[PDB]
Amino acid sequence: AKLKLIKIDGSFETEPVKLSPGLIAKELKQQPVFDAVLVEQASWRQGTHSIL
RNA sequence: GGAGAUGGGGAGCUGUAGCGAAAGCGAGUUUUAAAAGAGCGUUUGUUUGUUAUUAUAGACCCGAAACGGGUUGAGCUAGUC
Numbered sequence: 664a665k666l667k668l669i670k671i672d673g674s675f676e677t678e679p680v681k682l683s684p685g686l687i688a689k690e691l692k693q694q695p696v697f698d699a700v701l702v703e704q705a706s707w708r709q710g711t712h713s714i715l
Numbered sequence: 716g717g718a719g720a721u722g723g724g725g726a727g728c729u730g731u732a733g734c735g736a737a738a739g740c741g742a743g744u745u746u747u748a749a750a751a752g753a754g755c756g757u758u759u760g761u762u763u764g765u766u767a768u769u770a771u772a773g774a775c776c777c778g779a780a781a782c783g784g785g786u787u788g789a790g791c792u793a794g795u796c
Contacts, residue, residue, distance in 0.1 A: 698764060699720080706719050 664687075668676040 694764090701764090703720060709718085 664682040666680050666682065668678075668680070670676065
């Protein structure tokens with residue numbers, strides 16, 4: 664993928680860069696991502712909610 | 716490790732060949748003298764999320780005279796001193 668590099672001032676560099684495979688997929692799936700975000704919201708409770 | 720996903724940790728479980736109680740045998744096993752017959756065979760996947768049902772935990776919930784253990788009780792009242 665074609666990318667650019669920025670500096671501390673806030674200006675782009677003068678040389679782009681490509682990216683080799685390793686994080687680019689050809690498949691599609693959202694239900695895995697759906698349960699991923701759901702379990703991300705999980706592990707946040709601590710059982711404080713309780714009554715007699 | 717923000718008590719996180721995750722990474723590591725393959726301990727174990729499913730199916731991968733089964734027959735029966737077994738010595739054991741094995742695409743055959745056991746019953747039988749049977750190579751007769753019959754049975755079972757003759758791979759057809761795993762883990763989660765979810766829904767419903769079922770199993771135990773009070774398990775839709777309300778309800779009794781119940782039972783057991785402990786405890787206050789002679790000033791009402793019974794008897795006695």
